[PDB]
Amino acid sequence: PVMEELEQGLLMQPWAWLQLAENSLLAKVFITKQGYALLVSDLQQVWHEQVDTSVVSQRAKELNKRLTAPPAAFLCHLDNLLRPLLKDAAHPSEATFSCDCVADALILRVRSELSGLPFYWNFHCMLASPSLVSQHLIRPLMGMSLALQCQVRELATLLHMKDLEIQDYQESGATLIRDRLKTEPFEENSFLEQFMIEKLPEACSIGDGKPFVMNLQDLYMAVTTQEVQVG
Amino acid sequence: VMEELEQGLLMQPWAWLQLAENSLLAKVFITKQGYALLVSDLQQVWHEQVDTSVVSQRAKELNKRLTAPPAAFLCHLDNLLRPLLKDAAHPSEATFSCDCVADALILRVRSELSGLPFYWNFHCMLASPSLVSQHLIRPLMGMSLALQCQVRELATLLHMKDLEIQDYQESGATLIRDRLKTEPFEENSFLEQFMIEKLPEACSIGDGKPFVMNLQDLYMAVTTQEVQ
Amino acid sequence: MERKISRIHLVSEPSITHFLQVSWEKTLESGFVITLTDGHSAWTGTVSESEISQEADDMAMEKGKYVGELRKALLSGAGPADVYTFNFSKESCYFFFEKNLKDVSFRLGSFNLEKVENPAEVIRELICYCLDTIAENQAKNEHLQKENERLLRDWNDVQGRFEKCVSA
């Protein structure tokens, strides 16, 4: 059951932007006293990891020897180190991050100072399975796109109603005072034609993934929650 | 040769496919030198790129009595497939059946040309992470960003229209039709109402039909922009 | 014992026309005996129900459709757009027929014919049957023409009688 709770928590969490020494990644981490689950990506490949208390203790002992800590304390310290970075960036961290892309696997090394002493950890993230990758990226993105299309349709209907009201005002023996405040009739086809050639090239640039985390996270979280509730 | 097939597959839209009470999303690009196919079920993605030599080798074993060159076979397959993918509720003379053995999908299509049987099987293995990402993830993120920009533009237009209506209201007269009164547009209130009311139905991907029917032109435009 | 004679043009020898005679008892499904001749030599073969069923199973389609295609090809019942190619290896006496479709062809059927020591007998039989059917058709046409003439005369007479009676 603990693994199931870890998976559900990882699914609930939103994407965050991580700036390594040279590159950038999109990461989602869920840490509990029983272990943790991590999912990283760079818009080309997705790596996933999930570890339990025993693995955490073994890795802590083998990496940073001379430290005798229970797995729960190590997990809590890892959460304290990671969560602030994911919530906000460009703030005092003092936690170096590095990545090594070994054959068909990734190693994410995190270094920090725990009360003025070294503290090292490594995430051994293997290639994520298609099922998990799909459930975490593809279906939520399609749901978000459909929701945004519905929002656009609703806004278009509202604009049509406002245009009808303006037409009624004009036809009711009216005379606009400020000619500058004159909105032209709204046409869906014309607006789409203008947009696709004026703003799509600059509005469809994902880049390194920063816009995705900065703009479409609330919708992503809502879609993921709805999918979880459905099934 | 090989690169042209990949570019054509990338520049193609998703189509809905029905087979044995099951649904699939298919992208196919067929030329005289081979074909490329990508099939997804919202859980896994399979890909198949095929050249003329293997086309002939498989056709001679599937249809023993068929004596055709690879180009003619590919042209016939394209003429058979494209009408079905383009739209449904048409004279579908082809029957499709998909099966999983271990990790690869076998998609068998059986039809009749001039009344004689015609079989073809796609042995599509699981798509590589790079192909899946390039074909689904990045285009979808671009589409979401474009739709958000469209929503922002719509909100600005609504604000301008509300300003004009307020100009009339403050200095003007009253509407002859009182039923046309519209409330001021607030972005936060509208977003809250949408999220709590229509998000559950709006975000219902279902079996992939709404994705194909609603937004495909945006997907094609985003993919083309990514190519350039 | 229905019989049908057709003229075909083998690809090997397109400068001359061969004659294919297909004879069946009740229906093509049960079986048929085919004979290919060119005025000098004849090759006779037979096809049974088992062979037709095996060919249909190999080609993986219903027996009815295969029988219809065989009727359209061998019996010269082709439609407005239907091209059939007949090949015959004389050295091996292997006669097959296929359906041409744009740039692809289907091996519709194949048989192994054998030479007959006396082609003259079969040629004479074919010519005699043709003459007999010609004579029978001519007699039937003459009888039908006589009946039509009699019916026309009677109709004209009755029309005149009705014309008189309507005024009476």
Going across the sheet that includes C2-8, the strands are: C2-8, C18-24, C31-37, C42-48, C114-115
Q: Which residues pair with B76 in a beta bridge?
A: none
SS3 B12: coil
Angle in degrees, CA B17, B13, A220, rounded to 5: 90
| Inter-residue contact C4 to C75 (CB < 8 Å) | yes
The residue written with tokens 């048989």 in the block is C111
| Inter-residue contact B215 to A149 (CB < 8 Å) | yes
Kindly give the pairing relationship between strand C18-24 and strand B95-100: unpaired
The residue written with tokens 């294919």 in the block is C20
Tokens of C21: 């005679």
Tokens of B40: 């997804």
| Inter-residue contact A119 to A112 (CB < 8 Å) | yes
Kindly report the length of chain B: 228
> Which residue does chain A place closest to B154, by CA atoms?
A155
- Distance (Å, whole) CA A151 – CA B202: 9
CA distances (Å), origin B194, targets A135, B97, B188, B189:
24, 40, 10, 9
Q: What is the DSSP string of B79-140?
A: HHHHHHHH-SSS----EEEEEESSS-EEEEEEEEETTEEEEEEEEEEEPPHHHHIIIIIHHH
Tokens of B133: 């990402």
Contact B67 C106 (CB under 8 A): yes
Kindly report the length of chain A: 231
Tokens of C121: 């007998």
| Inter-residue contact B14 to B216 (CB < 8 Å) | yes
| Residue B153: CB atoms within 10 Å | 18
SS3 A72: helix
Q: How far is CA A209 from the centre of its chain?
A: 9
Handedness of CA C149, C152, C158, C163 (dihedral sign): negative
Task: Residue C79: name the closest of B66, B75, B111, B115 by CA.
Answer: B115
H or E stretch covering A153: helix A139-171
User: How far is A174 from chain B, CA to nearest CA, in Å?
Assistant: 6
Asked if the C-beta of B114 comes within 8 angstroms of chain C's C-beta atoms, the answer is yes
Chains C and A touch (3+ CB pairs under 8 A): no
Which chain A residues touch B146 with a CB distance below 8 Å? 195, 199-200, 203-204
- Distance (Å, whole) CA A50 – CA A28: 12
CA distances (Å), origin C146, targets B71, C134, C135, C140, C151:
61, 18, 17, 10, 9
Kindly give the pairing relationship between strand B23-31 and strand B34-40: antiparallel
The residue written with tokens 């609930």 in the block is A12
Nearest by CB: B155 against A46, A155, A182:
A155
**Cβ burial C113-123 (10 Å sphere, 16+ → b, else e):** beeeeebeebb
Task: Residue B66: name the closest of C73, C94, C101 by CA.
Answer: C101
Residues 157-196 of B with CB under 8 A from A: 157-158, 160-165, 167-168, 171-177, 180-182, 185, 190, 194-195
The residue written with tokens 């008189």 in the block is C164
Contact C106 B71 (CB under 8 A): no
Tokens of A60: 């802590």
H or E stretch covering A50: strand A46-52
Amino acid identity, position A50: Q
Solved how? cryo-EM
Nearest by CB: C101 against B69, B71, B114:
B114
User: How far is C160 from chain B, CA to nearest CA, in Å?
Assistant: 56
Contact C103 B114 (CB under 8 A): no
Asked if the C-beta of C106 comes within 8 angstroms of chain B's C-beta atoms, the answer is yes
Task: Residue B158: name the closest of B194, B195, B183 by CA.
Answer: B183
How does DSSP classify residue C156?
Answer: H
What is the CB-side half-sphere exposure of residue B45 using CA atoms within 13 A? 24
H or E stretch covering B159: helix B138-170
Could you tell me which chains touch chain B, where touching means 3 or more CB pairs under 8 A? A, C
Tokens of B115: 């009344």
| Inter-residue contact B104 to B118 (CB < 8 Å) | no
